[PDB]
Amino acid sequence: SGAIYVGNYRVVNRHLATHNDWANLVWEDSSRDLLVSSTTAQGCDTIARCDCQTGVYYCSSRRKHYPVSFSKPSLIFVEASEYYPARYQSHLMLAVGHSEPGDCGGILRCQHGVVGIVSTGGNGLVGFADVRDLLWLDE
């Protein structure tokens, strides 16, 4: 689990969104596994606006942060789950690292701010849903 709080928005994995996220829906994209809902309280996370490929992510299955090199946002095949059939997930970035399903929502950050959230795992790889292109998150 985990979310990003920026302004009047909450960003979560679409497969983990609550009834409240759906009742206050702003935008959702199944191909990206992202959902954004509106909040009453003001969020203070800074979203990065960069092309960084190095950062640090939070891994809850290890209670630890790990430094990683990650790929550029791209369309990558993701195996079937209780949430989606087998498909290409867009805007996905991979890194060599530890991830379990419960790790989804852990934030990836660079020196410029929040890059994205854990969205896939397995085989000694971790996938992050990128959020840096969502320029409207700030306005």
Beta bridge partners of 56: 67, 109
The residue annotated as part of the active site, out of 21, 59, 103, 104, is: 104
Q: Are strands 25-29 and 64-69 parallel, antiparallel or unpaired?
A: unpaired
Nearer to Zn ion, 16 or 73 (CB): 73
Residues in the chain, total:
139
* Partner from ligand A1BS6, Zn ion, none contacting 119, C-beta within 5 to 8 A by type: ligand A1BS6
Answer yes or no: 15 catalytic. Answer: yes
Q: For residue 7, give the nearest of 40, 34, 29, 33 by alpha carbon.
A: 40
- The residues near 136 (Cβ < 8 Å, ≥ 6 apart) are none
**From the list Zn ion, ligand A1BS6, none, which binds 50 (C-beta under 5 to 8 Å, kind-based)?**
Zn ion
Q: Tokens standing for 42?
A: 């003001």
Shortest Cβ 101–ligand A1BS6 spacing (Å): 4
Cβ proximity to ligand A1BS6: between 133 and 138 the closer is: 133
Q: What are phi and psi of 25, to 5 degrees?
A: -65, 135
Which positions touch ligand A1BS6 (CB under 6 A)? 15, 33, 78, 81, 83-84, 89, 99-101, 103, 119-122
Strands 113-120 and 107-110: antiparallel
Nearer CB in complex with ligand A1BS6: 67/122 = 122
Residue type, 13: N
The listed partner (ligand A1BS6, Zn ion, none) that binds 52, CB under 5 to 8 Å by sort, is Zn ion
Least Å from the CB of residue 41 to ligand A1BS6: 27
Q: Is 104 a known active-site residue?
A: yes
Residue 44 counted as an annotated binding residue: no
Neighbours of 64 (CB within 10 A): 10
